[PDB]
């Protein structure tokens, strides 16, 4: 089997040589004629109370009004972010959940976790009470991140090293994406709804298409497990957060690692990464009970958002980019602007 | 008319918010009174043989156990529907007040990897506060296994030769001293890492049990009482 090793080595060094040849110049010196981003630290405008256990996941939706928060008590709470009033408090069959999703329409909500099942509920029903709409089962591992792309098909990331794209009505699996060797922990959808990227515990982010089951591209460059992922608002770049206390911005077209955000005073892992609307500010939640905002051009620490007593679990930015929601393990959601 | 309608719907939204907040506050008392337990162990460790008369009341990802002792409900988890990697879903169990860690003391390799798993659970950053109730399952199997003479303890642990039974150890009646020496050697092998990295915060509660003993619920009740008392004493900055 020495010929297989030789072929793998020759393809690997061909990839390395192509990446080196296409790396004509780094982008650190490219962003040299631009002004630095000032200190734009923000204050907690509202704090959401009511959860009885730690908050793990969170989502916004198209309108920047209806937050979703998932707790390990077994609660999916939908919050009105403006006036601070809870709208629905859905109880769950399995208390251990790690993901929640809000559809582009306001009709459906989703959840999943250690039960290996993605449960979706209606919101605007005829009777007026929330109930278990559908029960997508078929994963042999824990769900980490489920994301809606429409009202009829969903994409889910599981710990069984495989991602899936399900259809809602028939309850079957439309496509199955395999090729990771570690637990897939994060999943982000491109704005055009044609591609997505999944970060795993392989120090690897794989970019997949939704029409075909094949893997479009693979990105390496981390040292530990990837916990968070997010496309650029343009859709031709993405940022990955990992446990090596470094964020890494990759670009789609060059298949190259571009920017490494790291510091010598940080050793804690990175749990949640979300971009701003313009793509300049990069908000990353850390395990040192704080969050850090960087810029995507100078790779400098723009500011620090503090005020959590436990580790951060989820970080989100509205589609219009106004409010930033941080949910940590002290049962509190903080809204920033 | 539009202003009246918007005031009416604002009042209705406030009323619904107050109602569901009252429901959450009502469920809070029931939630923070039943103690949660997370059970860990190997395939041959005797995972489901801890509690037998509450094992059957009459999904496969998580198996559940409800059992009530002295008007206190105990809500027991065991996770077996996932894969062998466990560094990511063990962070979902930060808030659990006790880890029931069951060790097979008969088959050995097995005890070394159980010891390594105990090291990983004890030294984990998000499990650094959780107390571990450690069960030494299959004590009878160990009792005939150490008297069989075919398996030598020295081969799998070179430090057994320079070991003696502790004076604080109370041997059970009706057994030779060598099985007591073996059991307390295993207990000390677990306690040497149980009492090395934890500077307060959490300690272990070693217990001996088999497939016949039916008093494990009482031991779990006493351990949980000690755990909650210690947490209350620590949260009042009483060092």
């Amino acid at each position: 089997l020495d010929q297989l090793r030789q072929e793998a080595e020759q393809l690997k060094n061909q990839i390395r040589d192509a990446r080196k040849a296409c790396a004509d110049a780094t982008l650190s010196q490219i962003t040299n004629n631009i002004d630095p981003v000032g200190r734009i630290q923000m204050r907690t405008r509202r704090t959401l109370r009511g959860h009885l256990a730690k908050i793990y996941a969170m989502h916004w939706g198209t309108d920047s009004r209806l937050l979703v928060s998932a707790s390990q008590d077994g609660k999916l709470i939908i919050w009105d972010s403006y006036t601070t009033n809870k709208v629905h408090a859905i109880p769950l069959r399995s208390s251990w959940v790690m993901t929640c999703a809000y559809a582009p329409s306001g009709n459906y909500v989703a959840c999943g976790g250690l039960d290996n099942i993605c449960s979706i509920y209606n919101l605007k029903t005829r009777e007026g009470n929330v109930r278990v709409s559908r029960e997508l089962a078929g994963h042999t591992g824990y769900l980490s991140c489920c994301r809606f792309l429409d009202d009829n098909q969903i994409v889910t990331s599981s710990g069984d090293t495989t991602c899936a794209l399900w259809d809602i009505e028939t309850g079957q699996q439309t496509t199955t994406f395999t090729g990771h060797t570690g637990d897939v922990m994060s999943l982000s959808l491109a704005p055009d709804t044609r591609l997505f990227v999944s970060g795993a515990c392989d120090a690897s982010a794989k970019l997949w298409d939704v029409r075909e089951g094949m893997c479009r591209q693979t990105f390496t460059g981390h040292e530990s497990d990837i916990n968070a992922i997010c496309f650029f608002p343009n859709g031709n770049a993405f940022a990955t957060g990992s446990d090596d206390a470094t964020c890494r911005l990759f670009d789609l077209r060059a298949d190259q690692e571009l920017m490494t955000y790291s510091h010598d005073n940080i050793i804690c892992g990175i749990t949640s990464v979300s971009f701003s609307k313009s793509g300049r500010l990069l908000l990353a939640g850390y395990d040192d009970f704080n969050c850090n905002v960087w810029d995507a051009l100078k790779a400098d620490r723009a500011g620090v958002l503090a005020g959590h007593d436990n580790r951060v679990s989820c970080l989100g930015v509205t589609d219009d980019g106004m409010a930033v929601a941080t949910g940590s393990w002290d049962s509190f959601l903080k809204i920033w602007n | 008319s539009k202003t009246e309608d918007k005031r009416a719907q604002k009042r209705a939204e406030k009323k619904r918010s107050k109602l569901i907040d009252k429901q959450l506050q009502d469920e809070k008392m029931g939630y923070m009174c039943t103690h949660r337990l997370l059970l860990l162990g190997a395939d041959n460790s005797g995972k489901s043989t801890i509690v037998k008369q509450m094992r059957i009341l009459h999904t496969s990802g998580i198996f559940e156990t409800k059992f009530q002792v002295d008007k206190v409900n105990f809500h027991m988890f065991d996770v077996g529907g996932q894969r062998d990697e466990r560094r990511k879903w063990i962070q979902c169990f930060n808030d659990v007040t006790a880890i029931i860690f069951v060790v097979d003391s008969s088959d050995y390799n097995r005890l070394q990897e159980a010891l390594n798993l105990f090291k990983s659970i004890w030294n984990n950053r998000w499990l650094r506060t959780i107390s571990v109730i450690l069960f030494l399952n299959k004590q009878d199997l160990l009792a005939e296994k150490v008297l069989a003479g075919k398996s030598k303890i020295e081969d799998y642990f070179p430090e057994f030769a320079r070991y003696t039974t502790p004076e604080d150890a109370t041997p059970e009646p009706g057994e030779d001293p060598r099985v007591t020496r073996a059991k307390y050697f295993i207990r000390d092998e677990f306690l040497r890492i149980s009492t090395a990295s934890g500077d307060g915060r959490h300690y272990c509660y070693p217990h001996f049990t088999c497939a016949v003993d039916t008093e494990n619920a009482r031991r779990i009740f006493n351990d949980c009482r000690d755990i909650i008392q210690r947490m209350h004493l620590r949260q009042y900055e009483l060092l």
Partner: nanobody
Amino acid sequence: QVQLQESGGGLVQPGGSLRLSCAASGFTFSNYKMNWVRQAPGKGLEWVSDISQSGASISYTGSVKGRFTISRDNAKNTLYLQMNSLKPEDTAVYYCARCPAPFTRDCFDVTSTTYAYRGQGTQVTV
């Protein structure tokens, strides 16, 4: 890319001391701690030894105590396993692995051939 190339071992005569070498590229070698794991034919993955970041805290399993030694140099970014003579029951394939968190002392590096940060390994027989 993080990779752990391995060399040494195999057709080894008994009575001689050899040095199984692991060369690490990718991760910074100083910030992490490393493990040696072995797999026998017909048996599962078995942890053999572990060494911390500074090399002060070294731990072994019971079956290798007093005979095998493990060490590492961060300046050369290399790790070594010194073995004296052999054992008739050590015919196995050896992997050098790393738990995926730098500044921790807890690791989960035994899998059913599904772990990521683990080298190809070298097979040694007597």
